[PDB]
């Protein structure tokens, strides 16, 4: 039984990345997945991702540029306070200037660095570096 | 896989992307609903109705042709079965095993299957009571199964 | 000693223990 489609997408992405493949097929399609992909794309850790429309959950084909070390999800989505970002970043990321911890806040899917600017917090859902 | 077996076999029907009636159909939505009502009035189950329409009369998908699924058409026309298809076939199957188990007592394999058949009925009837298809006081009883099927 | 017959020896000793308790009871 599918329980975390976000984990399925990131696991498939990471498997293709470690194998050296330049692209990966992702099923199914979710609003969280697309927003999570766009966070990758803004920092350039991926390239083009294309969504195939269907009369069901869609598919995504992501073109990988090879500059992607590790992407993973967090289960459950712990409720994080503003004072807890630094502990979460330290215990989970490499050196604190490359990776980006992904949260879901009332402002939407967005980074841990962006949270410090906007002074908001929420639930941790993933990470990359 | 299967809910009551190892059974990891994938086999289904792939609905085409069209969502539009093909150009070779010249039948009116009024006509096909008349076909649906006539078949249901005779006694055909909504699963059986789709088969005969698809195989003989060329209706690939009733929803594509009309816009409503067969059961919602039947309820609108007041011809929906009192008992849902899913329970009726499951209860009828359980009744069949009982008559075999009464005669054959050493069939411990048939005894085990009856438990699985009964377990599906209880899980199913629990869902119908949740959505409101069946009364909350509806209960499947061993000796009363034959009465419901008749 | 084999564990199969260490188990048998203890199991025999347990049966004798229950008889001694029934005698007192």
């Amino acid at each position: 039984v599918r329980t975390s489609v976000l984990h399925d997408a990131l696991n498939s992405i990471n498997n293709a990345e470690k194998a050296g493949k330049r692209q990966v097929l992702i099923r199914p399609s979710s609003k969280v997945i697309i927003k999570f992909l766009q966070v990758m794309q803004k920092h350039g850790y991926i390239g083009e991702f294309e969504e195939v429309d269907d009369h069901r959950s869609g598919k995504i084909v992501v073109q990988l540029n090879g500059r992607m070390n590790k992407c993973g999800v967090i289960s459950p989505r712990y409720n994080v306070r503003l004072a807890e970002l630094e502990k979460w970043v330290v215990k989970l990321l490499p050196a604190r200037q490359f990776g980006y911890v992904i949260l879901t806040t009332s402002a939407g899917i967005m980074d841990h660095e962006e949270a410090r600017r906007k002074h908001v917090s929420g639930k941790i859902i993933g990470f990359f570096y | 896989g299967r809910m009551h077996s190892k059974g990891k076999g994938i086999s289904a029907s792939a609905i085409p992307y069209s969502r539009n009636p093909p150009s070779w159909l010249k039948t009116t939505p009024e006509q096909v609903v008349d076909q649906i009502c006539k078949l249901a009035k005779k006694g055909a189950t909504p699963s059986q109705i789709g088969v005969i329409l698809r195989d003989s009369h060329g209706i690939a998908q009733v929803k594509v042709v009309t816009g409503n699924k067969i059961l919602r058409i039947l309820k609108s026309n007041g011809l929906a079965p009192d008992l849902p298809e899913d329970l009726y076939m499951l209860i009828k199957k359980a009744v069949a095993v009982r008559k075999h188990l009464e005669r054959n007592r050493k069939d411990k394999d048939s005894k085990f299957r009856l438990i699985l058949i009964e377990s599906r009925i209880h899980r199913l009837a629990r869902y119908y009571k949740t959505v409101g298809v069946l009364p909350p006081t509806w209960k499947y009883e061993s000796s009363t199964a034959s009465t419901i099927v008749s | 000693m084999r564990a199969k017959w260490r188990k048998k020896r203890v199991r025999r000793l347990k049966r004798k223990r229950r008889k001694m308790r029934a005698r007192s009871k």
């Binding site: 289960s75 459950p76 989505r77 712990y78 | - | -």
Partner: protein, 144 residues
């Protein structure tokens, strides 16, 4: 690893499972059951006093051939009988029948230490005088 629950509302299962599995920890089980207060020869205390009942010799475990000098001591506080090792060369002469001696732990946490089998306590003071003080030329045994 283990198939531990990972839901956000599974704290009850996580705490209950930890409480059950913590009993297998030997040191927590000893403290939680309070076995020192129940079964230990001492009442959980570091030391205890008793009356010397007799002097016994204990053969050393292999590979070691010697007679470790010990005394059977009946504790005053509860009446339990234990065997106490008498350390240092020739200190068994100071101890005598019906003396009042103070006993302590012998090594680590009630386990016998060294090649002395079944001895888990040692003599510290005799007649209110330290055994080392008697063994050295420092103090004198009470006149009595």
């Amino acid at each position: 690893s283990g198939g531990k629950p990972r839901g956000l509302n599974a704290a009850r299962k996580l705490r209950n499972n930890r409480r059950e599995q913590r009993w297998s920890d030997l040191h927590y089980k000893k403290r939680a059951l309070g076995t020192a207060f129940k079964s230990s020869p001492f009442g959980g205390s570091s030391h205890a006093k008793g009356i010397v009942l007799e002097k016994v010799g204990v053969e050393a475990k292999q590979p070691n051939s010697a007679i470790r000098k010990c005394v059977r001591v009946q504790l005053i506080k509860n009446g339990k009988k234990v065997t106490a090792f008498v350390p240092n060369d020739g200190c068994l002469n100071f101890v005598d029948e019906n003396d009042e001696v103070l006993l302590a732990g012998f090594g680590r946490k009630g386990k016998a230490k060294g090649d002395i089998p079944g001895v888990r306590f040692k003599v510290v003071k005799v007649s209110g005088v330290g055994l080392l003080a008697l063994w050295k030329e420092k103090k004198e045994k009470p006149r009595s």
